[PDB]
């Protein structure tokens, strides 16, 4: 089998991407944030504290003839950005772009933190990291990809995120028309439960390539590119007036600037992030200080190849017996 679904930016800055997901019988369609940095499929629901729902579409398990309470199971998760959610668990039928899994764990939120409530466009998350990170207790549950894998034509999914435009998540096949040149594959460590790999270096604009190993995660659920402070300083030094602001929480730059590109290495291959991808707009409405899309990972404890990086590439998440990652230009 295969599946194919369009993923759409939630706003004009590409702050995140939503993909429609069918849950239950009859189908209840929710728009979920596909997150290769976590491993829980959770949704706003009929059980969510009423004051914590503000415009989201909810899953109502009592209206699904295929929903079954997973007795005794609870979940609770906290994300790198400080947000969190928790609740109980059902199993139900879940389909993405024509690909169907029966008996998928659907984690129903009883509580969500403020940033989720405040974002009316995201109805929940669909985790695509390794199932070892799944938070369900006392019986850990599998991700949608893990449940689907054996049935897929090839044990892979691909992320093709757009810049200020829709893109595609495919399951079970590689669309050879969606990229240019060849796909360069690189090793993955699953020891922390992430799609963790090592970039071979970087360049700033038309500058010379610096060969250096940068360990990090391919994370569709993180907006920006978080890299070591040395790398980030070298980038922003090429933008007149750019500076790190403690009060804002990162590098800012004059909105009047033209940003240079940023290149990252994948083996001997190179992915170029155009400068415009690195502009995240005014820090507050009407400001002429703009927020940068490349930020320091210092104090996160890990480098993160988030959407800013991933959207410049066609990315293969290869779930073969030994997982690997593939990157192509597009």
Curated annotation (Swiss-Prot):
Keywords: Aspartyl protease, Disulfide bond, Hydrolase, Protease, Signal, Zymogen
Catalyzed reaction equations: Hydrolysis of proteins with specificity similar to that of pepsin A, prefers hydrophobic residues at P1 and P1', but does not cleave 14-Ala-|-Leu-15 in the B chain of insulin or Z-Glu-Tyr. Clots milk
Name of the top EC class for this enzyme: hydrolase
EC number: 3.4.23.22
Active site: 35, 199
Cystine pairings recorded for this chain: 255-290
MF term (GO), any: aspartic-type endopeptidase activity
Domain of life per record: Eukaryota
GO biological process: proteolysis
Domain Peptidase A1, first and last residues per copy: 17-328
Family indicated by similarity: Belongs to the peptidase A1 family.
Protein name: Endothiapepsin
Gene from which this protein is expressed: EAPA
Part of the intact protein present: 90 to 419 of 419
């Amino acid at each position: 089998s295969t599946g194919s679904a369009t993923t759409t930016p939630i706003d004009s800055l590409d702050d995140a991407y939503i993909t429609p997901v069918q849950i239950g019988t009859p189908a209840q369609t929710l728009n979920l944030d596909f997150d290769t940095g976590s491993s829980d499929l959770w949704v706003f629901s009929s059980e969510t504290t009423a004051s914590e729902v503000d415009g989201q579409t909810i899953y109502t398990p009592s209206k699904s003839t295929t929903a079954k309470l997973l007795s005794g199971a609870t979940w609770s998760i906290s994300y790198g950005d400080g947000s969190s959610s928790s609740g109980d668990v059902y199993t139900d039928t879940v389909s993405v772009g024509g690909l169907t899994v029966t008996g998928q764990a659907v984690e129903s939120a009883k509580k969500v933190s403020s940033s989720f409530t405040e974002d009316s466009t995201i109805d929940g998350l669909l985790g695509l990291a390794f199932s070892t990170l799944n938070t369900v207790s006392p019986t850990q549950q599998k991700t949608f990809f893990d449940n689907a894998k054996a049935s897929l034509d090839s044990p892979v999914f691909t992320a093709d995120l757009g810049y200020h435009a829709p893109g595609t998540y495919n399951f079970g096949f590689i669309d050879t028309t969606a990229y240019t040149g060849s796909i360069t594959y690189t090793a993955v460590s699953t020891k922390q439960g992430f799609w963790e790999w090592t970039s071979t270096g970087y360049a700033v604009g038309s500058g010379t390539f610096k060969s250096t190993s940068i360990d990090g995660i391919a994370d569709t659920g993180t907006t920006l590119l978080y890299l070591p402070a040395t790398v980030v300083s070298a980038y922003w030094a090429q933008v007149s007036g750019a500076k790190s602001s403690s009060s804002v929480g990162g590098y800012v730059f004059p909105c009047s600037a033209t940003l240079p590109s940023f290149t990252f290495g994948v083996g001997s291959a190179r992915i170029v992030i155009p400068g415009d991808y690195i502009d995240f707009g005014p820090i507050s409405t009407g400001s002429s200080s703009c927020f940068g899309g490349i930020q320091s990972s210092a104090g996160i404890g890990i480098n993160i190849f988030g959407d800013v990086a991933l959207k410049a590439a066609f990315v293969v998440f290869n779930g073969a017996t030994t997982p690997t990652l593939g990157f192509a230009s597009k």
